[PDB]
PDB file of N, CA and C in Angstrom:
ATOM      1  N   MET A   1      -8.479 -28.904  19.241  1.00  0.00           N
ATOM      2  CA  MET A   1      -9.267 -30.112  18.852  1.00  0.00           C
ATOM      3  C   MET A   1      -8.475 -30.924  17.829  1.00  0.00           C
ATOM      4  N   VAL A   2      -9.057 -31.976  17.320  1.00  0.00           N
ATOM      5  CA  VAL A   2      -8.352 -32.816  16.304  1.00  0.00           C
ATOM      6  C   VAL A   2      -9.374 -33.333  15.290  1.00  0.00           C
ATOM      7  N   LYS A   3      -8.943 -33.654  14.099  1.00  0.00           N
ATOM      8  CA  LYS A   3      -9.900 -34.163  13.072  1.00  0.00           C
ATOM      9  C   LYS A   3      -9.176 -35.114  12.119  1.00  0.00           C
ATOM     10  N   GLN A   4      -9.586 -36.353  12.091  1.00  0.00           N
ATOM     11  CA  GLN A   4      -8.932 -37.342  11.188  1.00  0.00           C
ATOM     12  C   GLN A   4      -9.489 -37.187   9.770  1.00  0.00           C
ATOM     13  N   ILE A   5      -8.639 -36.943   8.810  1.00  0.00           N
ATOM     14  CA  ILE A   5      -9.117 -36.793   7.403  1.00  0.00           C
ATOM     15  C   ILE A   5      -9.141 -38.180   6.755  1.00  0.00           C
ATOM     16  N   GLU A   6     -10.307 -38.691   6.468  1.00  0.00           N
ATOM     17  CA  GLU A   6     -10.401 -40.047   5.854  1.00  0.00           C
ATOM     18  C   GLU A   6     -10.369 -39.945   4.326  1.00  0.00           C
ATOM     19  N   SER A   7     -10.597 -38.781   3.777  1.00  0.00           N
ATOM     20  CA  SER A   7     -10.580 -38.655   2.290  1.00  0.00           C
ATOM     21  C   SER A   7     -10.368 -37.196   1.878  1.00  0.00           C
ATOM     22  N   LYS A   8      -9.992 -36.983   0.646  1.00  0.00           N
ATOM     23  CA  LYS A   8      -9.762 -35.595   0.147  1.00  0.00           C
ATOM     24  C   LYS A   8     -11.000 -34.737   0.418  1.00  0.00           C
ATOM     25  N   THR A   9     -12.154 -35.343   0.464  1.00  0.00           N
ATOM     26  CA  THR A   9     -13.398 -34.563   0.718  1.00  0.00           C
ATOM     27  C   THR A   9     -13.293 -33.842   2.065  1.00  0.00           C
ATOM     28  N   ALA A  10     -13.071 -34.573   3.121  1.00  0.00           N
ATOM     29  CA  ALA A  10     -12.967 -33.939   4.467  1.00  0.00           C
ATOM     30  C   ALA A  10     -11.776 -32.969   4.501  1.00  0.00           C
ATOM     31  N   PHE A  11     -10.812 -33.151   3.642  1.00  0.00           N
ATOM     32  CA  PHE A  11      -9.630 -32.240   3.648  1.00  0.00           C
ATOM     33  C   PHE A  11     -10.068 -30.801   3.349  1.00  0.00           C
ATOM     34  N   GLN A  12     -10.741 -30.586   2.253  1.00  0.00           N
ATOM     35  CA  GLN A  12     -11.174 -29.200   1.906  1.00  0.00           C
ATOM     36  C   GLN A  12     -12.161 -28.674   2.950  1.00  0.00           C
ATOM     37  N   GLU A  13     -13.169 -29.435   3.274  1.00  0.00           N
ATOM     38  CA  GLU A  13     -14.161 -28.961   4.279  1.00  0.00           C
ATOM     39  C   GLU A  13     -13.463 -28.677   5.612  1.00  0.00           C
ATOM     40  N   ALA A  14     -12.401 -29.380   5.906  1.00  0.00           N
ATOM     41  CA  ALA A  14     -11.689 -29.142   7.195  1.00  0.00           C
ATOM     42  C   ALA A  14     -10.982 -27.784   7.153  1.00  0.00           C
ATOM     43  N   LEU A  15     -10.413 -27.428   6.032  1.00  0.00           N
ATOM     44  CA  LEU A  15      -9.710 -26.116   5.942  1.00  0.00           C
ATOM     45  C   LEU A  15     -10.740 -24.984   6.011  1.00  0.00           C
ATOM     46  N   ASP A  16     -11.839 -25.126   5.323  1.00  0.00           N
ATOM     47  CA  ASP A  16     -12.878 -24.058   5.353  1.00  0.00           C
ATOM     48  C   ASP A  16     -13.524 -24.010   6.740  1.00  0.00           C
ATOM     49  N   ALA A  17     -13.671 -25.140   7.377  1.00  0.00           N
ATOM     50  CA  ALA A  17     -14.297 -25.159   8.730  1.00  0.00           C
ATOM     51  C   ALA A  17     -13.349 -24.512   9.742  1.00  0.00           C
ATOM     52  N   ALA A  18     -12.066 -24.635   9.537  1.00  0.00           N
ATOM     53  CA  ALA A  18     -11.102 -24.021  10.493  1.00  0.00           C
ATOM     54  C   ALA A  18     -11.318 -22.507  10.516  1.00  0.00           C
ATOM     55  N   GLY A  19     -11.604 -21.925   9.382  1.00  0.00           N
ATOM     56  CA  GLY A  19     -11.841 -20.453   9.333  1.00  0.00           C
ATOM     57  C   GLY A  19     -10.510 -19.707   9.213  1.00  0.00           C
ATOM     58  N   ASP A  20     -10.144 -18.967  10.230  1.00  0.00           N
ATOM     59  CA  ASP A  20      -8.865 -18.186  10.203  1.00  0.00           C
ATOM     60  C   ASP A  20      -7.914 -18.723  11.282  1.00  0.00           C
ATOM     61  N   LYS A  21      -8.290 -19.768  11.963  1.00  0.00           N
ATOM     62  CA  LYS A  21      -7.399 -20.311  13.025  1.00  0.00           C
ATOM     63  C   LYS A  21      -6.242 -21.073  12.379  1.00  0.00           C
ATOM     64  N   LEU A  22      -5.172 -21.260  13.100  1.00  0.00           N
ATOM     65  CA  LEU A  22      -3.999 -21.979  12.527  1.00  0.00           C
ATOM     66  C   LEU A  22      -4.430 -23.404  12.146  1.00  0.00           C
ATOM     67  N   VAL A  23      -3.712 -24.036  11.252  1.00  0.00           N
ATOM     68  CA  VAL A  23      -4.079 -25.425  10.838  1.00  0.00           C
ATOM     69  C   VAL A  23      -2.810 -26.203  10.492  1.00  0.00           C
ATOM     70  N   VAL A  24      -2.269 -26.926  11.437  1.00  0.00           N
ATOM     71  CA  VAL A  24      -1.028 -27.715  11.170  1.00  0.00           C
ATOM     72  C   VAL A  24      -1.411 -29.162  10.848  1.00  0.00           C
ATOM     73  N   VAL A  25      -1.091 -29.623   9.666  1.00  0.00           N
ATOM     74  CA  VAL A  25      -1.439 -31.027   9.283  1.00  0.00           C
ATOM     75  C   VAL A  25      -0.236 -31.934   9.532  1.00  0.00           C
ATOM     76  N   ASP A  26      -0.458 -33.066  10.152  1.00  0.00           N
ATOM     77  CA  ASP A  26       0.659 -34.020  10.434  1.00  0.00           C
ATOM     78  C   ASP A  26       0.513 -35.246   9.533  1.00  0.00           C
ATOM     79  N   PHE A  27       1.427 -35.433   8.617  1.00  0.00           N
ATOM     80  CA  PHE A  27       1.351 -36.613   7.702  1.00  0.00           C
ATOM     81  C   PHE A  27       2.287 -37.703   8.224  1.00  0.00           C
ATOM     82  N   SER A  28       1.741 -38.733   8.812  1.00  0.00           N
ATOM     83  CA  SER A  28       2.594 -39.834   9.352  1.00  0.00           C
ATOM     84  C   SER A  28       1.894 -41.178   9.128  1.00  0.00           C
ATOM     85  N   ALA A  29       2.595 -42.260   9.342  1.00  0.00           N
ATOM     86  CA  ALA A  29       1.988 -43.611   9.152  1.00  0.00           C
ATOM     87  C   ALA A  29       1.499 -44.131  10.508  1.00  0.00           C
ATOM     88  N   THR A  30       0.229 -44.009  10.784  1.00  0.00           N
ATOM     89  CA  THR A  30      -0.288 -44.503  12.089  1.00  0.00           C
ATOM     90  C   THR A  30       0.084 -45.979  12.248  1.00  0.00           C
ATOM     91  N   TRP A  31       0.234 -46.677  11.157  1.00  0.00           N
ATOM     92  CA  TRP A  31       0.594 -48.116  11.239  1.00  0.00           C
ATOM     93  C   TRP A  31       2.082 -48.249  11.581  1.00  0.00           C
ATOM     94  N   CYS A  32       2.883 -47.307  11.162  1.00  0.00           N
ATOM     95  CA  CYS A  32       4.342 -47.370  11.468  1.00  0.00           C
ATOM     96  C   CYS A  32       4.538 -47.260  12.985  1.00  0.00           C
ATOM     97  N   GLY A  33       5.717 -47.566  13.469  1.00  0.00           N
ATOM     98  CA  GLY A  33       5.981 -47.497  14.943  1.00  0.00           C
ATOM     99  C   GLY A  33       6.771 -46.225  15.283  1.00  0.00           C
ATOM    100  N   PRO A  34       8.027 -46.181  14.887  1.00  0.00           N
ATOM    101  CA  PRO A  34       8.882 -45.013  15.163  1.00  0.00           C
ATOM    102  C   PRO A  34       8.194 -43.731  14.676  1.00  0.00           C
ATOM    103  N   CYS A  35       7.275 -43.851  13.759  1.00  0.00           N
ATOM    104  CA  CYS A  35       6.568 -42.641  13.251  1.00  0.00           C
ATOM    105  C   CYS A  35       5.456 -42.270  14.236  1.00  0.00           C
ATOM    106  N   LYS A  36       4.635 -43.223  14.575  1.00  0.00           N
ATOM    107  CA  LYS A  36       3.522 -42.971  15.532  1.00  0.00           C
ATOM    108  C   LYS A  36       4.104 -42.650  16.909  1.00  0.00           C
ATOM    109  N   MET A  37       5.388 -42.807  17.067  1.00  0.00           N
ATOM    110  CA  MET A  37       6.021 -42.516  18.383  1.00  0.00           C
ATOM    111  C   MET A  37       6.033 -41.001  18.637  1.00  0.00           C
ATOM    112  N   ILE A  38       5.830 -40.206  17.615  1.00  0.00           N
ATOM    113  CA  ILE A  38       5.845 -38.719  17.798  1.00  0.00           C
ATOM    114  C   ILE A  38       4.413 -38.198  17.977  1.00  0.00           C
ATOM    115  N   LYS A  39       3.513 -39.014  18.472  1.00  0.00           N
ATOM    116  CA  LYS A  39       2.110 -38.537  18.677  1.00  0.00           C
ATOM    117  C   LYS A  39       1.901 -37.908  20.081  1.00  0.00           C
ATOM    118  N   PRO A  40       2.695 -38.264  21.091  1.00  0.00           N
ATOM    119  CA  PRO A  40       2.501 -37.675  22.431  1.00  0.00           C
ATOM    120  C   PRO A  40       2.986 -36.219  22.415  1.00  0.00           C
ATOM    121  N   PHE A  41       3.395 -35.737  21.267  1.00  0.00           N
ATOM    122  CA  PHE A  41       3.894 -34.330  21.154  1.00  0.00           C
ATOM    123  C   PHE A  41       2.942 -33.524  20.268  1.00  0.00           C
ATOM    124  N   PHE A  42       2.910 -33.816  18.999  1.00  0.00           N
ATOM    125  CA  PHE A  42       2.012 -33.063  18.078  1.00  0.00           C
ATOM    126  C   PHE A  42       0.551 -33.231  18.516  1.00  0.00           C
ATOM    127  N   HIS A  43       0.052 -34.435  18.486  1.00  0.00           N
ATOM    128  CA  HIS A  43      -1.367 -34.674  18.881  1.00  0.00           C
ATOM    129  C   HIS A  43      -1.555 -34.376  20.374  1.00  0.00           C
ATOM    130  N   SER A  44      -0.501 -34.042  21.071  1.00  0.00           N
ATOM    131  CA  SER A  44      -0.635 -33.743  22.532  1.00  0.00           C
ATOM    132  C   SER A  44      -0.958 -32.258  22.737  1.00  0.00           C
ATOM    133  N   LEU A  45      -0.558 -31.411  21.827  1.00  0.00           N
ATOM    134  CA  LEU A  45      -0.849 -29.952  21.991  1.00  0.00           C
ATOM    135  C   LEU A  45      -2.360 -29.732  22.042  1.00  0.00           C
ATOM    136  N   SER A  46      -3.129 -30.729  21.713  1.00  0.00           N
ATOM    137  CA  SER A  46      -4.608 -30.562  21.742  1.00  0.00           C
ATOM    138  C   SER A  46      -5.047 -30.130  23.142  1.00  0.00           C
ATOM    139  N   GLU A  47      -4.414 -30.645  24.164  1.00  0.00           N
ATOM    140  CA  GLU A  47      -4.806 -30.269  25.556  1.00  0.00           C
ATOM    141  C   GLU A  47      -4.027 -29.032  26.015  1.00  0.00           C
ATOM    142  N   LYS A  48      -2.887 -28.772  25.433  1.00  0.00           N
ATOM    143  CA  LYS A  48      -2.092 -27.578  25.854  1.00  0.00           C
ATOM    144  C   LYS A  48      -2.589 -26.338  25.109  1.00  0.00           C
ATOM    145  N   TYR A  49      -2.632 -26.395  23.802  1.00  0.00           N
ATOM    146  CA  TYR A  49      -3.112 -25.226  22.997  1.00  0.00           C
ATOM    147  C   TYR A  49      -4.493 -25.553  22.425  1.00  0.00           C
ATOM    148  N   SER A  50      -5.529 -25.325  23.189  1.00  0.00           N
ATOM    149  CA  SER A  50      -6.905 -25.632  22.702  1.00  0.00           C
ATOM    150  C   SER A  50      -7.310 -24.645  21.601  1.00  0.00           C
ATOM    151  N   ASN A  51      -6.494 -23.656  21.334  1.00  0.00           N
ATOM    152  CA  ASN A  51      -6.840 -22.654  20.275  1.00  0.00           C
ATOM    153  C   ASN A  51      -6.083 -22.978  18.985  1.00  0.00           C
ATOM    154  N   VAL A  52      -5.809 -24.236  18.738  1.00  0.00           N
ATOM    155  CA  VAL A  52      -5.071 -24.631  17.494  1.00  0.00           C
ATOM    156  C   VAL A  52      -5.787 -25.807  16.829  1.00  0.00           C
ATOM    157  N   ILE A  53      -5.877 -25.802  15.522  1.00  0.00           N
ATOM    158  CA  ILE A  53      -6.570 -26.921  14.808  1.00  0.00           C
ATOM    159  C   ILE A  53      -5.519 -27.923  14.312  1.00  0.00           C
ATOM    160  N   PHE A  54      -5.565 -29.142  14.796  1.00  0.00           N
ATOM    161  CA  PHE A  54      -4.569 -30.177  14.364  1.00  0.00           C
ATOM    162  C   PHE A  54      -5.267 -31.244  13.520  1.00  0.00           C
ATOM    163  N   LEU A  55      -4.733 -31.540  12.360  1.00  0.00           N
ATOM    164  CA  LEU A  55      -5.343 -32.584  11.476  1.00  0.00           C
ATOM    165  C   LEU A  55      -4.429 -33.814  11.456  1.00  0.00           C
ATOM    166  N   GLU A  56      -4.998 -34.990  11.553  1.00  0.00           N
ATOM    167  CA  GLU A  56      -4.178 -36.245  11.534  1.00  0.00           C
ATOM    168  C   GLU A  56      -4.501 -37.024  10.259  1.00  0.00           C
ATOM    169  N   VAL A  57      -3.594 -37.030   9.313  1.00  0.00           N
ATOM    170  CA  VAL A  57      -3.836 -37.756   8.026  1.00  0.00           C
ATOM    171  C   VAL A  57      -3.016 -39.046   8.001  1.00  0.00           C
ATOM    172  N   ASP A  58      -3.635 -40.146   7.657  1.00  0.00           N
ATOM    173  CA  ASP A  58      -2.897 -41.445   7.595  1.00  0.00           C
ATOM    174  C   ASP A  58      -2.488 -41.709   6.142  1.00  0.00           C
ATOM    175  N   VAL A  59      -1.212 -41.720   5.863  1.00  0.00           N
ATOM    176  CA  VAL A  59      -0.755 -41.950   4.460  1.00  0.00           C
ATOM    177  C   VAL A  59      -1.167 -43.346   3.977  1.00  0.00           C
ATOM    178  N   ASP A  60      -1.963 -44.056   4.743  1.00  0.00           N
ATOM    179  CA  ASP A  60      -2.411 -45.429   4.327  1.00  0.00           C
ATOM    180  C   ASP A  60      -3.932 -45.435   4.151  1.00  0.00           C
ATOM    181  N   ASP A  61      -4.644 -44.734   4.991  1.00  0.00           N
ATOM    182  CA  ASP A  61      -6.130 -44.695   4.856  1.00  0.00           C
ATOM    183  C   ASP A  61      -6.509 -43.576   3.883  1.00  0.00           C
ATOM    184  N   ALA A  62      -5.835 -42.455   3.967  1.00  0.00           N
ATOM    185  CA  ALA A  62      -6.131 -41.308   3.052  1.00  0.00           C
ATOM    186  C   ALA A  62      -5.003 -41.184   2.022  1.00  0.00           C
ATOM    187  N   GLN A  63      -4.636 -42.271   1.399  1.00  0.00           N
ATOM    188  CA  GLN A  63      -3.542 -42.217   0.384  1.00  0.00           C
ATOM    189  C   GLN A  63      -3.917 -41.201  -0.704  1.00  0.00           C
ATOM    190  N   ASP A  64      -5.143 -40.753  -0.719  1.00  0.00           N
ATOM    191  CA  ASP A  64      -5.554 -39.758  -1.748  1.00  0.00           C
ATOM    192  C   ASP A  64      -4.938 -38.404  -1.397  1.00  0.00           C
ATOM    193  N   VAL A  65      -4.925 -38.065  -0.137  1.00  0.00           N
ATOM    194  CA  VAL A  65      -4.334 -36.764   0.283  1.00  0.00           C
ATOM    195  C   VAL A  65      -2.808 -36.862   0.246  1.00  0.00           C
ATOM    196  N   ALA A  66      -2.273 -38.016   0.539  1.00  0.00           N
ATOM    197  CA  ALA A  66      -0.791 -38.177   0.528  1.00  0.00           C
ATOM    198  C   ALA A  66      -0.275 -38.033  -0.910  1.00  0.00           C
ATOM    199  N   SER A  67      -1.008 -38.533  -1.867  1.00  0.00           N
ATOM    200  CA  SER A  67      -0.558 -38.428  -3.284  1.00  0.00           C
ATOM    201  C   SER A  67      -0.637 -36.969  -3.739  1.00  0.00           C
ATOM    202  N   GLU A  68      -1.753 -36.330  -3.526  1.00  0.00           N
ATOM    203  CA  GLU A  68      -1.892 -34.908  -3.950  1.00  0.00           C
ATOM    204  C   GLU A  68      -0.895 -34.040  -3.173  1.00  0.00           C
ATOM    205  N   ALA A  69      -0.697 -34.318  -1.914  1.00  0.00           N
ATOM    206  CA  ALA A  69       0.260 -33.503  -1.111  1.00  0.00           C
ATOM    207  C   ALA A  69       1.701 -33.888  -1.469  1.00  0.00           C
ATOM    208  N   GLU A  70       1.872 -34.898  -2.281  1.00  0.00           N
ATOM    209  CA  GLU A  70       3.249 -35.323  -2.674  1.00  0.00           C
ATOM    210  C   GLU A  70       4.095 -35.577  -1.420  1.00  0.00           C
ATOM    211  N   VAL A  71       3.570 -36.302  -0.468  1.00  0.00           N
ATOM    212  CA  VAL A  71       4.357 -36.600   0.767  1.00  0.00           C
ATOM    213  C   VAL A  71       5.210 -37.849   0.518  1.00  0.00           C
ATOM    214  N   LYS A  72       6.493 -37.673   0.302  1.00  0.00           N
ATOM    215  CA  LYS A  72       7.397 -38.839   0.031  1.00  0.00           C
ATOM    216  C   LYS A  72       8.403 -38.995   1.176  1.00  0.00           C
ATOM    217  N   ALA A  73       8.212 -38.292   2.260  1.00  0.00           N
ATOM    218  CA  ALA A  73       9.170 -38.406   3.401  1.00  0.00           C
ATOM    219  C   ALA A  73       8.433 -38.140   4.714  1.00  0.00           C
ATOM    220  N   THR A  74       7.939 -39.170   5.349  1.00  0.00           N
ATOM    221  CA  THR A  74       7.208 -38.988   6.639  1.00  0.00           C
ATOM    222  C   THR A  74       8.208 -39.154   7.797  1.00  0.00           C
ATOM    223  N   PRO A  75       7.944 -38.541   8.939  1.00  0.00           N
ATOM    224  CA  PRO A  75       6.761 -37.679   9.189  1.00  0.00           C
ATOM    225  C   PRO A  75       6.946 -36.296   8.538  1.00  0.00           C
ATOM    226  N   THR A  76       5.863 -35.667   8.146  1.00  0.00           N
ATOM    227  CA  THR A  76       5.949 -34.308   7.518  1.00  0.00           C
ATOM    228  C   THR A  76       4.839 -33.425   8.089  1.00  0.00           C
ATOM    229  N   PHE A  77       5.190 -32.269   8.597  1.00  0.00           N
ATOM    230  CA  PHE A  77       4.166 -31.340   9.175  1.00  0.00           C
ATOM    231  C   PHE A  77       4.000 -30.131   8.251  1.00  0.00           C
ATOM    232  N   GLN A  78       2.784 -29.827   7.866  1.00  0.00           N
ATOM    233  CA  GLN A  78       2.531 -28.655   6.965  1.00  0.00           C
ATOM    234  C   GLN A  78       1.674 -27.626   7.705  1.00  0.00           C
ATOM    235  N   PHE A  79       1.906 -26.362   7.452  1.00  0.00           N
ATOM    236  CA  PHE A  79       1.125 -25.283   8.139  1.00  0.00           C
ATOM    237  C   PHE A  79       0.179 -24.616   7.137  1.00  0.00           C
ATOM    238  N   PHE A  80      -1.107 -24.825   7.293  1.00  0.00           N
ATOM    239  CA  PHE A  80      -2.108 -24.211   6.361  1.00  0.00           C
ATOM    240  C   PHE A  80      -2.901 -23.135   7.106  1.00  0.00           C
ATOM    241  N   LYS A  81      -3.460 -22.199   6.388  1.00  0.00           N
ATOM    242  CA  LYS A  81      -4.256 -21.122   7.043  1.00  0.00           C
ATOM    243  C   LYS A  81      -5.267 -20.592   6.021  1.00  0.00           C
ATOM    244  N   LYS A  82      -6.500 -20.413   6.417  1.00  0.00           N
ATOM    245  CA  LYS A  82      -7.537 -19.932   5.453  1.00  0.00           C
ATOM    246  C   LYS A  82      -7.561 -20.863   4.235  1.00  0.00           C
ATOM    247  N   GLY A  83      -6.787 -21.919   4.262  1.00  0.00           N
ATOM    248  CA  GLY A  83      -6.744 -22.860   3.101  1.00  0.00           C
ATOM    249  C   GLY A  83      -5.538 -22.517   2.219  1.00  0.00           C
ATOM    250  N   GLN A  84      -4.508 -21.950   2.801  1.00  0.00           N
ATOM    251  CA  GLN A  84      -3.287 -21.577   2.014  1.00  0.00           C
ATOM    252  C   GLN A  84      -2.034 -22.063   2.751  1.00  0.00           C
ATOM    253  N   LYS A  85      -1.172 -22.779   2.079  1.00  0.00           N
ATOM    254  CA  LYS A  85       0.069 -23.264   2.748  1.00  0.00           C
ATOM    255  C   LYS A  85       0.963 -22.062   3.063  1.00  0.00           C
ATOM    256  N   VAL A  86       1.146 -21.762   4.327  1.00  0.00           N
ATOM    257  CA  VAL A  86       1.993 -20.591   4.724  1.00  0.00           C
ATOM    258  C   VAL A  86       3.264 -21.076   5.431  1.00  0.00           C
ATOM    259  N   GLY A  87       3.612 -22.327   5.283  1.00  0.00           N
ATOM    260  CA  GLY A  87       4.847 -22.829   5.954  1.00  0.00           C
ATOM    261  C   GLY A  87       4.823 -24.357   6.025  1.00  0.00           C
ATOM    262  N   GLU A  88       5.974 -24.971   6.106  1.00  0.00           N
ATOM    263  CA  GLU A  88       6.025 -26.459   6.182  1.00  0.00           C
ATOM    264  C   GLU A  88       7.458 -26.906   6.488  1.00  0.00           C
ATOM    265  N   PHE A  89       7.621 -28.070   7.054  1.00  0.00           N
ATOM    266  CA  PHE A  89       8.993 -28.563   7.361  1.00  0.00           C
ATOM    267  C   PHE A  89       8.926 -30.056   7.711  1.00  0.00           C
ATOM    268  N   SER A  90       9.804 -30.847   7.145  1.00  0.00           N
ATOM    269  CA  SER A  90       9.797 -32.318   7.421  1.00  0.00           C
ATOM    270  C   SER A  90      10.948 -32.676   8.361  1.00  0.00           C
ATOM    271  N   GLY A  91      10.684 -33.479   9.359  1.00  0.00           N
ATOM    272  CA  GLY A  91      11.764 -33.877  10.308  1.00  0.00           C
ATOM    273  C   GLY A  91      11.154 -34.246  11.659  1.00  0.00           C
ATOM    274  N   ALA A  92      11.756 -35.170  12.356  1.00  0.00           N
ATOM    275  CA  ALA A  92      11.214 -35.580  13.682  1.00  0.00           C
ATOM    276  C   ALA A  92      11.643 -34.568  14.746  1.00  0.00           C
ATOM    277  N   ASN A  93      11.360 -33.306  14.529  1.00  0.00           N
ATOM    278  CA  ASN A  93      11.743 -32.250  15.520  1.00  0.00           C
ATOM    279  C   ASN A  93      10.486 -31.792  16.268  1.00  0.00           C
ATOM    280  N   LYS A  94      10.111 -32.501  17.296  1.00  0.00           N
ATOM    281  CA  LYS A  94       8.885 -32.125  18.060  1.00  0.00           C
ATOM    282  C   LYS A  94       9.039 -30.722  18.655  1.00  0.00           C
ATOM    283  N   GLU A  95      10.230 -30.345  19.026  1.00  0.00           N
ATOM    284  CA  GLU A  95      10.428 -28.995  19.623  1.00  0.00           C
ATOM    285  C   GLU A  95      10.216 -27.915  18.559  1.00  0.00           C
ATOM    286  N   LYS A  96      10.415 -28.240  17.312  1.00  0.00           N
ATOM    287  CA  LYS A  96      10.222 -27.219  16.245  1.00  0.00           C
ATOM    288  C   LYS A  96       8.735 -26.868  16.134  1.00  0.00           C
ATOM    289  N   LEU A  97       7.870 -27.832  16.292  1.00  0.00           N
ATOM    290  CA  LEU A  97       6.411 -27.537  16.195  1.00  0.00           C
ATOM    291  C   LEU A  97       6.075 -26.348  17.098  1.00  0.00           C
ATOM    292  N   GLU A  98       6.713 -26.257  18.233  1.00  0.00           N
ATOM    293  CA  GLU A  98       6.429 -25.130  19.166  1.00  0.00           C
ATOM    294  C   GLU A  98       6.891 -23.808  18.548  1.00  0.00           C
ATOM    295  N   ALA A  99       8.164 -23.675  18.291  1.00  0.00           N
ATOM    296  CA  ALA A  99       8.679 -22.406  17.700  1.00  0.00           C
ATOM    297  C   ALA A  99       7.905 -22.073  16.422  1.00  0.00           C
ATOM    298  N   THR A 100       7.579 -23.060  15.635  1.00  0.00           N
ATOM    299  CA  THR A 100       6.834 -22.789  14.372  1.00  0.00           C
ATOM    300  C   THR A 100       5.392 -22.384  14.695  1.00  0.00           C
ATOM    301  N   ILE A 101       4.719 -23.133  15.527  1.00  0.00           N
ATOM    302  CA  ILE A 101       3.312 -22.780  15.872  1.00  0.00           C
ATOM    303  C   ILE A 101       3.274 -21.358  16.437  1.00  0.00           C
ATOM    304  N   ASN A 102       4.217 -21.011  17.270  1.00  0.00           N
ATOM    305  CA  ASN A 102       4.225 -19.640  17.852  1.00  0.00           C
ATOM    306  C   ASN A 102       4.632 -18.639  16.770  1.00  0.00           C
ATOM    307  N   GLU A 103       4.936 -19.123  15.597  1.00  0.00           N
ATOM    308  CA  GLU A 103       5.344 -18.212  14.490  1.00  0.00           C
ATOM    309  C   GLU A 103       4.101 -17.604  13.830  1.00  0.00           C
ATOM    310  N   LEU A 104       3.195 -18.432  13.371  1.00  0.00           N
ATOM    311  CA  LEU A 104       1.964 -17.912  12.698  1.00  0.00           C
ATOM    312  C   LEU A 104       0.797 -17.874  13.692  1.00  0.00           C
ATOM    313  N   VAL A 105       1.077 -17.934  14.965  1.00  0.00           N
ATOM    314  CA  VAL A 105      -0.025 -17.890  15.970  1.00  0.00           C
ATOM    315  C   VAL A 105      -0.679 -16.505  15.925  1.00  0.00           C
TER     316      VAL A 105
END
């Protein structure tokens, strides 16, 4: 499934709602072009891996989460679980999301 975080409020409730399932957050500029160009991959696993929780944060609408997350280099993918950061990596490597997702799966 997918869940757009509009504010820090939905951020915490989203991690607790996930439970123990994986939680990969994608920090990108939906308004940007070359950045939103990597959505047919990350946001695409929603139909391939229905057992994964994907969060889409807009560094422009939820600038509150971008500031607290200290995201200064988009796109940036972070791996959270039970509400704990257990991995993260910045780079336009769509193929890495696979090897990484299969890591804490």
